[PDB]
Amino acid sequence: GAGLADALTAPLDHKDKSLQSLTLDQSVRKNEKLKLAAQGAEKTYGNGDSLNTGKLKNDKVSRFDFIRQIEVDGQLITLESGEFQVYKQSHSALTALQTEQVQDSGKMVAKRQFRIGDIAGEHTSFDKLPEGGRATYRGTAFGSDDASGKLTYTIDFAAKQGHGKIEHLKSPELNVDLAASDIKPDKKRHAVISGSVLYNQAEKGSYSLGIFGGQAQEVAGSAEVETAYYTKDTNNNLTLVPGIRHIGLAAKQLEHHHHHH
């Protein structure tokens, strides 16, 4: 697939597959500039700009190089550097950022972080949900340095309650269970599910999924798993501090098309 450079250069096309535009909001805030570069050329994005996801492959992670910067007195200052990840589905898509370089004034230090960017798509109205039956969504859960997570979720529309499970991630602590939670309409009446995660029947963080698709075809959100990492003091004093591991979640129902299997 060589159309990943077309996502940064070619305009929006109505014939492109599935979700063709992603509004970059949380990925780049305020006056910041998010420069994406991959394959051939590059494109700079501002807050609210559109990402031409239509020319990216569905159900796969596209990887760009991102430089998050800001202008100070007419000159761009590199705030963050790393890899920008985009997972595209048919009615929803989400982005993630792997921090590789931060500031620490004029230089850049090497720090590795990972956060979830935007989670956008055709939000399903809570007032337009099915009434009865259980939908099975299967897809990907991807975290820092691991895109092979297998996400499985199921929603009961008669009880308005869904639950899930994450498997096959490299770190066995991240293979956590998505506890049962109710379907609730958010501020914009969109159908969202928020709950906790369970490892060995113990709370280890939270998770938030959004229902996307005109007929609730897909679910897309993120999970925050509670972990603990080491901090090396200025005198080599280790401290076991708590941290959060962010996991991108994106699943879809099994499709049945008119003219192909």
Residue numbers in the entry: 78 to 181, 185 to 308, 308A, 308B, 308C, 308D, 308E, 308F, ...
Question: How does the study describe this entry?
Answer:
We determined the atomic structures of ChAs with VR2 P1.16 inserted into position 151, 294, or 309, all of which generated PorA-dependent SBA titres. These structures were solved using molecular replacement to resolutions of 2.9 Å for fHbpV1.4:PorA151/P1.16, 3.7 Å for fHbpV1.1:PorA294/P1.16 and 2.6 Å for fHbpV1.4:PorA309/P1.16. All ChA scaffolds align with good agreement (route-mean-square deviations (RMSDs) range between 0.447 and 0.614) to fHbp V1.1, demonstrating that the fHbp scaffold is not perturbed by insertion of VR2 P1.16. In each structure VR2 P1.16 adopts a β-turn conformation that extends away from the fHbp scaffold. In ChAs, the VR2 N- and C-termini are effectively locked into a 'biological' β-turn peptide mimic by neighbouring fHbp β-strands, as confirmed by our atomic structures. We demonstrate that integration of a VR2 loop does not alter the overall architecture of fHbp and that the VR2 loop folds into a conformation recognised by a bactericidal mAb. SBA titres were detected with antisera raised against fHbpV1.1:PorA294/P1.16 when alum was used as the adjuvant, and with antisera raised against fHbpV1.1:PorA151/P1.16 (a low level of SBA from a single mouse), or fHbpV1.1:PorA309/P1.16 when MPLA was the adjuvant.
The recombinant subunit vaccines Bexsero and Trumenba contain an important meningococcal antigen, factor H binding protein (fHbp), which is a lipoprotein composed of two β-barrels that tightly bind domains 6 and 7 of human complement factor H (CFH). fHbp is antigenically variable; databases of genome sequences contain more than 900 different fHbp peptides, which fall into three variant groups or two subfamilies: V1 (subfamily B), V2 and V3 (both subfamily A). Here we use structure-based design to generate chimeric antigens (ChAs) against serogroup B N. meningitidis. ChAs exploit fHbp as a molecular scaffold to present the surface-exposed PorA VR2 loop, which is achieved by inserting the VR2 loop into a β-turn region in fHbp. ChAs retain epitopes from both fHbp and PorA, and can elicit functional immune responses against both antigens.
